[PDB]
Write an enzyme that holds these catalytic residues in place. Sequence first.
Site, PDB file in Angstrom:
ATOM      1  N   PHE D  36      34.990  16.859  46.762  1.00  0.00           N
ATOM      2  CA  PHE D  36      35.658  18.083  47.174  1.00  0.00           C
ATOM      3  C   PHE D  36      37.162  18.050  46.954  1.00  0.00           C
ATOM      4  O   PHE D  36      37.779  19.122  46.893  1.00  0.00           O
ATOM      5  CB  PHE D  36      35.369  18.392  48.654  1.00  0.00           C
ATOM      6  CG  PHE D  36      36.149  17.539  49.632  1.00  0.00           C
ATOM      7  CD1 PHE D  36      35.789  16.217  49.852  1.00  0.00           C
ATOM      8  CD2 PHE D  36      37.227  18.063  50.333  1.00  0.00           C
ATOM      9  CE1 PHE D  36      36.493  15.432  50.751  1.00  0.00           C
ATOM     10  CE2 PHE D  36      37.938  17.279  51.229  1.00  0.00           C
ATOM     11  CZ  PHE D  36      37.568  15.962  51.435  1.00  0.00           C
ATOM     12  N   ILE D  56      44.869  15.227  58.728  1.00  0.00           N
ATOM     13  CA  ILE D  56      43.886  15.175  59.809  1.00  0.00           C
ATOM     14  C   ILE D  56      43.956  13.828  60.526  1.00  0.00           C
ATOM     15  O   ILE D  56      44.559  12.859  60.045  1.00  0.00           O
ATOM     16  CB  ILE D  56      42.474  15.445  59.270  1.00  0.00           C
ATOM     17  CG1 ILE D  56      42.195  14.536  58.067  1.00  0.00           C
ATOM     18  CG2 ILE D  56      42.318  16.912  58.903  1.00  0.00           C
ATOM     19  CD1 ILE D  56      40.884  14.814  57.357  1.00  0.00           C
TER      20      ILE D  56
END
Lengths: 48, 404, 42, 107
Positions: D36, D56
């Site tokens: 991805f 993150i």
Amino acid sequence: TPDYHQHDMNFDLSKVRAVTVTMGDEQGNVHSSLKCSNCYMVWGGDFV
Amino acid sequence: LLLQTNLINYVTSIRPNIFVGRAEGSTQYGKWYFEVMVDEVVPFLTAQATHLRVGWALTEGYSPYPGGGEGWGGNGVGDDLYSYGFDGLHLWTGHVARPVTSPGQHLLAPEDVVSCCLDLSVPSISFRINGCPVQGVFEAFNLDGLFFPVVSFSAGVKVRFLLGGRHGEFKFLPPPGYAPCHEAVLPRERLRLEPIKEYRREGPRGPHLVGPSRCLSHTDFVPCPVDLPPHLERIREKLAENIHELWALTRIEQGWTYGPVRDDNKRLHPCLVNFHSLPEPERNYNLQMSGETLKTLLALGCHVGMADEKAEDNLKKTKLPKTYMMSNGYKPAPLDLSHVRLTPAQTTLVDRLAENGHNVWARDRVAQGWSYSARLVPYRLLDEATKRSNRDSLCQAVRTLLGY
Amino acid sequence: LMPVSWSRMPNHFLQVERLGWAVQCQDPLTMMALHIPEENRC
Amino acid sequence: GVEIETISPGDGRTFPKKGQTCVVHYTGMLQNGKKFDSSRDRNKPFKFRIGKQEVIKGFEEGAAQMSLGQRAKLTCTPDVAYGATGHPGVIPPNATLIFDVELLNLE
């Protein structure tokens, strides 16, 4: 499974690919015993 | 649902000429060993990683197919059920990988050695990092053909490939009992590196389109020995003595005049006398393997019948090359089995009989634990030199046709 | 099952004795591919 | 839970501290094997500041445990990275994220 390309007219259940993977520790005692086969069937002649 | 797309690099596989397999017959030992040298420092040249793997694959791979593949592109070894390989951190069988454990826990890096294993009674494959074992073994095979030492590489790779006694300097000691894999070669040519299932090759004009090649099989690598008129059993010694004439012919050139002590190195021989003067196991030595040969000769399908009877003695011997005479008085003199130019079938029937002789002796050698170690292969697969002597030796026995 | 297909021939291949009998490979090469997910060829 | 599995060895003495930049040439994948993200198709290395909550939570607790020049493989659980709604159009909701991070220079 999709990775199966045995096209033969003399096929019996002995002519099935099957690879047994085993892993263990450094002591040598096993730790799993996996069998991958490209085919999961039965024989209809084994019932009648 | 949709049709995703991306970029894939290319990979190719290379294997040696060696061919090892297990079957009833000449099957060597089922214990082989080799290493390899890697000195490549390009992990992320052109985006994706540089694929590098080594292992075994059986003789029905057809994997190379440069271009598309199954998972992503025309991948190399390990992504099928016809090839078993290792990368440094994973075992690949059926395009799915599992992690392995070892001291160091790093994949193939420059200045490293990997050792593979082969043992076809358990049959199972193990691997060994430079100096430590790799904790994992493949089992439950379906061995039916032969095996390739296979390597996988993406690009920018200059791996040196180790074999053994020929030139491969084994850094480490093989475990107890393992052929260095240089002995197993086709005894009709030299060894070389070639790409498997190649269908385009370069040339002075350029590309060359080549179709499918040929290959051996389990059955092929297995020697198989082949399965009364008074005159058939009447000749016996007459053909044996005619064969026994040549037993000194070139042993005169060797200079072996009836050595009484069997000089195996200083040029003398102990069985160079007449049949009755010969030792006990010397009459069937030239007749049992010949009488059975004549007995089997009916199964050879030949069209032979003893009907010459030309004066029954016109077969005259050739002698008197100077002294040429021993203490025994033999003075070897082959008879007149010289002007017999055989038949088109006999040109192959003698060879077919010669093939039986090589095969029969192969079974005898195989019976004693494959000659009990310490170098003969099946007929029509053996060397060229052995194909020469066996024709002339059996021909003299076969030249008695149309003589008796 | 039918044991035949029609695959294309790439216009450029991977191109390529002494101590160790080393292999030769310098240049890189790549290609574009599809991943029809139902049965997963590429 | 961040499972850091190493791929190639590194220096082993230089580790990132607070308020310090890092350059990371990562390439991210999903659990199924579908890529991805990659930062090497663009040929521009990702640079982030540690502790200021740019990346993150699974990425910085993943990059803090490595050394200079080390390349490891993370398996970020879906609890620590895009739990419920996810990132629309890229990552499906409740999906496990795999990162092959490599720290090039500067801790």
